[PDB]
């Protein structure tokens, strides 16, 4: 229903440009480094399948990224922000469904305090009114008397 | 100038999706082209054999199923593939769900707001006017008094 | 702080137009610099003819159609081409046209809230203060009475 | 929860701008490599090259110029890069500035909307009173009469 399928098309650019990055650091993996690694970055798809390993942490005690970290000593300049624009697009991805929630939960209470003010304004003028009435009668009465 | 506020988040979708089949295909032709010249064999033949695995063309005689019988792992391609570019093409139709809905709630936002404040402007007026009628009727009351 | 709003939607727009020069680029140069090396036969070639072919400077030397008489099934390509590049150039007029239309949509929207509330605070401050008035009266009315 | 409703659109922008480094290096390599082997003649040079020049650390050490003196034309593709690139960065800071601006308005216009229901609430209440105790010296002023 409409509140979480609003937030969709957002999600979707998320993870397009989260597959977006994958690729050209995967033709940029291959570019940098596969002529000396190539097991790991010597073709396009081995570059694909190295960066998902170093996302998921299958390289945490093989670690792929620390033996070409100490070839070419510069290469976190590469590992780093892969790392970091990849985690953050992850991350969106959570961020859009927790914000798409709330954000329905805060209009929902929108109305039912602006549907309660409208009610206690219509009935204390409705309280008002009828004791107008009741008075505006006995004064009636009052010049009644005085006939 | 409703749908057409939403035609820039339109563009972003399609253009992504372009996108995937840019690099679907620039992938699938280093993946399998070596071994089916025929489907992936170049870039424009890579784009095509995508195209009509998505079009249901290759459902009988399924584009997939031979490179899944070759490479057994191959599915690590074809199904994100067809998951995005349809996820894609639906939040096109999503969008203009949207567009839609959101214009009729917003709508009908003011219709009821309005009605609201009719409705305060009547209900003061009522009393209002049955107040001057009293004041009118108590200085009636205080000339016989003098 | 209106149109700065709308800036990082102009932006998605302007860097996936670019994107869509990129890939009609590398797909112009496979499916054609073969044949026409002139105009698709290198990444900047194609670049460029497909740079011409929007600005209508390929309209009575229209690169287009020679191509499409050799190949005739590349309307497919300069086809969605032209549709994608002009919906997103058009999706940024859009974006500033509904950005300028939607902050006077919001400034009119307080003006006519705070006339309410105006009037409201002042057809109540004529109705108390015509109270005050009837009291008084009324109490007059009662040493009459004592 | 009011700049974290803003992220995702930080990373479109983010994203998009490493996707034109990208592209443009792409297209750097191509245009210049060939005669700039130093600079363009890798994609990772190319990356780097690009990268310097927005860094402005291409300013009397400047890359830009030499490829601008051989190749004439070669603004087409300096320019535009210079523009997009700059363009996203500052659609990065505009979409914090967005943010926190945007919950300063949503914040006052809760304490405004309060105030005035507030005010209503009371200037009722202050009417109501003075009903009630005249309703009462009414009927006080009514045994006067029996
Ligand atoms: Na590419
Ligand atoms: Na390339």
Not at 23 to 37: C, K, P, Q, R
């Amino acid at each position: 229903v409409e509140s979480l399928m609003q937030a969709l098309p957002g999600i979707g650019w998320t993870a397009a440009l989260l597959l977006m990055m994958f690729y050209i650091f995967a033709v940029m993996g291959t570019e940098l480094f596969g002529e000396a690694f190539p097991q790991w970055f010597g073709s396009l798809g081995a570059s694909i399948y190295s960066l998902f390993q170093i996302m998921t942490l299958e390289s945490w005690s093989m670690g792929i990224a620390r033996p070409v970290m100490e070839v070419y000593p510069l290469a976190w300049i590469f590992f780093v922000p892969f790392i970091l624009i990849s985690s953050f697009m992850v991350l969106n991805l959570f961020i859009a469904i927790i914000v798409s929630a709330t954000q329905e939960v805060h209009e929902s209470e929108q109305r039912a305090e602006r549907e309660a003010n409208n009610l206690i304004a219509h009935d204390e003028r409705q309280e008002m009114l009828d004791l107008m009435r009741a008075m505006h009668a006995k004064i009636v009465a009052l010049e009644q008397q005085g006939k």
